[PDB]
Design a protein around this ligand. Structure first.
Ligand code: 8DG
Ligand SMILES: OC[C@H]1O[C@@](CO)(O[C@H]2O[C@H](CO)[C@@H](O)[C@H](O)[C@H]2O)[C@@H](O)[C@@H]1O
Ligand code: MN
Ligand code: MN
Ligand code: MN
Length: 129
């Protein structure tokens, strides 16, 4: 079974809203809401990966961020380790830089059912902030 390391960014503005994108219909976890992020490549660290992935996907450079949660999840056909970075400072304005839907969502209104099931404990912990 495939094993992947994934770094994602929880992008939180001053109004307690999170920048959330929606995954393509032909992707793994198709049509799900998601924190922007992606695969950690050989020769880069988890910290470097979340910077690169947010630059690619939404056009911001995260800075002074922290590891909010790290967890493992077994999907039906792949095992993934997810690094959830809390990003409260960044350069740029996030947008759908890869043509994907993206918008600001109130933290209190997030519904874990809309996200991959791996995100359930993270969404709960976020609402506890
Ligand atoms: N990006 C992201 N992926 C998540 C989340 N929760 C979750 O289980 N996943 C899973 C879905 C995928 O199996 C994997 C993310 O890989 P990805 O498809 O974003 O990887 P990528 O951006 O590097 O891929 P690509 O655009 O090059 O095709 O992790 C999340 O909140 N954000
Ligand atoms: O690992 C994140 C953790 O480390 C601290 C310093 O103790 O932040 C450092 O690492 C971040 C990720 O690379 C950087 O963004 C930050 O600038 C750097 O100081 C903590 O702030 C954070 O919890
Ligand atoms: Mn990507
Ligand atoms: Mn991605
Ligand atoms: Mn990638």
């Amino acid at each position: 079974m495939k094993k992947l390391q994934i770094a994602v960014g929880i992008i939180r503005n001053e109004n307690n809203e999170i920048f959330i994108t929606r995954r393509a219909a032909d992707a793994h976890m198709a049509n799900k809401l998601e924190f922007p992020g992606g695969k950690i490549e050989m020769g880069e660290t988890p910290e470097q990966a979340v910077v690169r992935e947010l630059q690619e996907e939404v056009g911001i450079t995260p800075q002074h961020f922290s590891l909010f949660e790290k967890l493992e999840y077994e999907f039906p056909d792949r095992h993934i380790t997810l690094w959830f970075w809390l990003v409260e400072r960044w350069e740029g304005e996030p947008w759908g830089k890869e043509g994907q839907p993206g918008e600001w969502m109130s933290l209190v209104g997030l519904n874990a059912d809309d996200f991959p099931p791996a995100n359930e404990p993270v969404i709960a912990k976020l609402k506890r902030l």
